[PDB]
Each structure stands twice: as structure tokens, then as C-alpha cells.
Amino acid sequence: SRNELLKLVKKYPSETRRARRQRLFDAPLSVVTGLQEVTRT
RNA sequence: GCGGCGAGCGAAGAGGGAUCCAACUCGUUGCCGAAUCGGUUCUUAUAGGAACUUGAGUUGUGGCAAUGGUGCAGGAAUGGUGAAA
Ligand SMILES: [Mg+2]
Ligand SMILES: [Mg+2]
């Protein structure tokens, strides 16, 4: 069951610093990560 | 007021004044969530710039609300000079 779920998380990566900058000249769906963000969610 | 309440000890508020264009920052909360930092390169710059970096960092950086480079000058200040008979 775990291996199934972590493969799901991997399907929704946070955008990399290289791309996040590149997006912002103008976000993709991704897993919330971080105790503070995850606590809100 | 303390104290063999003895010898003794003993302040604070206020008030006059000095000073004072004297205040701010986190954590937290909320809204975001790497926007951060370090290093590399770069612009005449270990810029509060830029590109780049998994390197640190979400076991939480940071933001929001509750400058650096180059140029000229003057000044001031120190010195240097400089009177009468
Ligand atoms: Mg005493
Ligand atoms: Mg913080």
C-alpha cells in the first residue's frame, strides 16, 4: 500500500527551482510538503 | 520601612532637570511557501543586481498584516604658513 502511495506522490512533484522561476515570467498541481503547509491543509 | 526594633540600615512613586526629530526585531497568529540562504560566474561589485548551482533549507529560509560601482567636488578637521613696535 505504501509503495503505491509514494509512487503517487512522485507523480505530483513540486516544481524545481529551475522551472519555478521559468513559470513566473507570466502552479502545476503538486503534493503539499512541509509541516507548516501540511498542517494547514 | 528593616532591625538582638539595639548598634544600626533604609528606599520608591511623584516633582524640577539632563537625554531624547528613540525606538525596533523575532517567535507566534493569519495569508503565501524557497520567493531564502551558501557557493560559482557576471557585470569596473565576496551589490540587498543577474545567471547559475542540491549545496544548506520545508524537522521552515523568507516576504506581507496584525543598494552596490564609479565620478567630481566643497566643508569640517587636523596640520603647513603667517603681522607691530
Ligand atoms: Mg545594607
Ligand atoms: Mg520565519
Final resolution, Å: 2.5
Question: What does DSSP assign to residue A3?
Answer: H
- Give the closest nucleotide to A37 (alpha carbon vs C1'): B33
Q: Measured between alpha carbons, how far is A25 from A41 in angstroms, rounded to an integer? A: 27
Q: Measured between alpha carbons, how far is A36 from A29 in angstroms, rounded to an integer? A: 18
Method used to determine the 3D structure:
cryo-EM
Q: How far is the CA of A10 from the C1' of B23 (A)?
A: 50
Q: How far is the CA of A39 from the C1' of B70 (A)?
A: 50
Q: Measured between alpha carbons, how far is A8 from A36 in angstroms, rounded to an integer? A: 21
The residues near A29 (Cβ < 8 Å, ≥ 6 apart) are A12
Q: Measured between alpha carbons, how far is A1 from A21 in angstroms, rounded to an integer? A: 35
What does the block give as the cell for A36? 507548516
